[PDB]
Amino acid sequence: TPRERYRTQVRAEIKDHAWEQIATAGASALSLNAIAKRMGMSGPALYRYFDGRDELITELIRDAYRSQADSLRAAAASGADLAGLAHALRAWALDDPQRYFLIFGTPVPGYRAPDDITEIAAETMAVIVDACAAGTDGAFDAHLDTHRQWADRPAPSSALHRALSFWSRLHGVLSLELAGQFTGMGFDSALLFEAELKDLLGP
Template sequence: MTEGRAGGPRERYRAQVRAEIKQAALDQVANGGAGAVALTGIAKRLGVSGPALYKYFASRDDLLTELILDAYAEVATAVAAAAEASRDASPRDRLHALAAAYRDWALAHPQKYLLLTGPPSPTYQAPPETVDRARAVLGPFLAVLAEGRPGTGAADVRDQLVRWAEATPAVAAWVRAFAPDGDAGDALTGAVTVWARLHGVLGLATVGLFAGMGFDPAALLHAEIDALADQYGLP
């Protein structure tokens, strides 16, 4: 009678198998990138038939989507915790705290981070939920950068992003939610800029391209965030 209830033996077994499938897929990502994820290889590792996996994930893309959503949820939690812990600090220090939280998560979970750096395959179509999760990660950055002004150096980018927000209600609502009192164009420009700088440094660091160069990538990221804080005049 209890096997069909939430939390019963059957549901616990299903959750365990799903977790094992996801871990096997993450191991494949670690060894060969997102393109290496293969249900046949996962089935072989788990000692089950290929068709048996489809009881847990309808397709390879469904599995990848869940991994991406999980990764976004994890890093969003880390960034939100940093935002709360640093809420009484200066805007510059808050920005550094957010970037450090993102950095620490990415370096601790490089295989998950790789899933966030681009489509896992040429045919993969990301569902809208992944975009919502990405905005949740960047929201705290947007809130801090809304307190500054970028000057005129990013005017062209700002104008383009403002037009994008005006044409995309979900983007406009996101900006209003995190920066209700700031300049929407400046805040959005800052969020996109910090996103580019984070991925620029961390994308190279997580695949080992800084190895042997004799410097700490964390120091480079700190300098990049400091430069952005200077650009926005954050105290």
């Protein structure tokens, strides 16, 4: 609440420059000292905002998850179904590939997250599950009945199975396209994405 919370805004500048360094030199090469020198501050002073690189990484990871959740929440809040949710996910992904890859891409060497980066990952995933209430037979569903601590609200495990399939199928195409893998394949990966979505929607 209080005034000395222009700190939130300098932290926002710090975080901003952190993306630049990630963009140009990659996470892990990311350093609070280059930031400090970039903003003409003392190295120490920058540590009075983030006590170390992992604290900074951690916050960037949290910020990333939070905007993924916002994108998807807005879609469900506008009464969209899985299709709408899939399209929310595409634009969020394509809107900022660097942000996508900090979550879904190459892990940052040496960095171990606090448990609440996954405890903020189930946010996004609750919404998908919500939609997939739109039990059913099959071996993975059976497994999921005893393995679902990531959702006591009350949906048949087939809906959880469908949610996981939506997640993995659409990330498969998003990160393959963002990873440059359909370059020189000359088809329209957006149509591939449409196909995979369609195939997935009540198949």
